Amino acid sequence: LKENLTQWEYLALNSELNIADGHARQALSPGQQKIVNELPVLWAESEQRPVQQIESEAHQAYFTLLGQHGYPAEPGRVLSCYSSSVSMEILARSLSASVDRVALVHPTFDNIADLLRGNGLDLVPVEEDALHGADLSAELLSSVGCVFVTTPNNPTGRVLAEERLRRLAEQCAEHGTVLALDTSFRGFDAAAHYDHYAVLQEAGCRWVVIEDTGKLWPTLDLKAGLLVFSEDIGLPVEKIYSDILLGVSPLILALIREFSRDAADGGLADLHAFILHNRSVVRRALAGVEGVSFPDPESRSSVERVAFAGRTGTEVWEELQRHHVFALPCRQFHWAEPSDGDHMVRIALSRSTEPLEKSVQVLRTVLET
């Protein structure tokens, strides 16, 4: 009855032991609370300055924070959207003007698949081993108009390394295909902080990148998706963007600027340390527990997959929910073959440690019948 992962996440939104959706719900740091305390000042600034200047500063702060020095800073090359999913809707509807089929990494967050399919695009799954380990086949590239990679991936944390991004961008250029990247989880893993725009521009392929500020910091879902596109993209992303919105709030852009600056001043290292700590408490707690394993040993992402033998993720979810703990079954990340995820749940790590600890102790007991 839960048609997608988001509908599983609705069930958790009002519980103290929500470890389902990937949004950041941990406490603000002291430096971040100082930003919140200055919100009336940021409001006045947002009333008094031209939005283009605030937007330019927010983009500069965020892209430079994460190593993306080559981003196109000319006004209009980075489209600020209400969310990365709104960017994805724009991209999907734009793709459907001239593309029939999209090669898409599998598993990935399911609304990428569902927005693409919903706009009439046929999807070809590319498993992670194929995507990272070998060139894509000429047969595949000639049959699709776009290759879409989430990196770091959700739910696996896998990062497309620079050499492979380069080869993929070269392949797309050679075939005329759009390379599209979703880099929502970029901030969590320094392996994703090499300059992606430099690679893409040097390869000369048609490209689109959707950045997202929404997953890094606990900003009560105040965020923007940033839809960045090559000059030759050849899709009507600018026109469809303008059908949907005039722009985002200057106050949100100012918040993104301030949170990015705090992150540059040591907040980002603290975040990495915090996620590492929370991953450690989860793995320590599901220690022995016969039948339990962690499919993504090297992930640095803010979500964590847990696998179990002889139990189903939906079953674990129901036993968990009877104790008011809400996680996420993994089936629907495997948008082309949901049974691939039948024996996994996903746990959200962007949480205060104490509620996370309590939820994982509950899972330890459950997983011990």
Binding-site residues: 110, 114
Write down the residue that tokens 């640095």 correspond to: 300
Q: Which does 220 bind (CB under 5 to 8 A by kind): a second copy, ligand EGV, ligand EQJ, none?
A: a second copy
Q: Which does 192 bind (CB under 5 to 8 A by kind): ligand EGV, ligand EQJ, a second copy, none?
A: none
Q: Choose, by CB under 6 A, the member of 8, 12, 22, 229 that binds ligand EGV.
A: 22
Q: Which amino acid is at 319?
A: E
Nearest to 253 by CA among 67, 50, 65: 50
| Tokens of residue 262, six digits | 């705090």
317 near ligand EGV (CB under 6 A): no
| Cα dihedral 81, 82, 83, 87 in deg (nearest 10) | -30
Binding mask 55-84 for a second copy (x = CB under 8 A): ---------------------------xx-
Q: Which does 182 bind (CB under 5 to 8 A by kind): a second copy, ligand EQJ, ligand EGV, none?
A: ligand EQJ
Nearer to ligand EGV, 83 or 260 (CB): 83
Nearer to ligand EQJ, 22 or 145 (CB): 22
Q: Could you tell me where the DSSP H helices lie in 124-217?
A: 128-133, 138-143, 162-175, 196-203
Work out whether the CA dihedral 22, 183, 266, 31 comes out positive or negative. Answer: negative
Write down the residue that tokens 């919140």 correspond to: 36
Binding mask 121-150 for ligand EQJ (x = CB under 6 A): -----------------------------x
Q: Choose, by CB under 8 A, the member of 29, 79, 89, 207 that binds a second copy.
A: 89
14 near a second copy (CB under 8 A): yes
Cβ-based neighbours of 80, under 8 Å, separated by 6 or more: 55, 58, 59, 224, 225, 226, 247, 248, 253
Write out the DSSP string of 110-139.
HHHHHHHHHTT-EEEEEEHHHHHHSPPPHH
Q: Which residues bind a second copy (CB under 8 A)?
A: 3-4, 6-7, 9-10, 13-14, 21, 23, 27-28, 36-37, 39-40, 43, 46-47, 50-53, 82-83, 85-86, 89, 93, 111, 114-115, 118-119, 218, 220-222, 239-240, 242-252
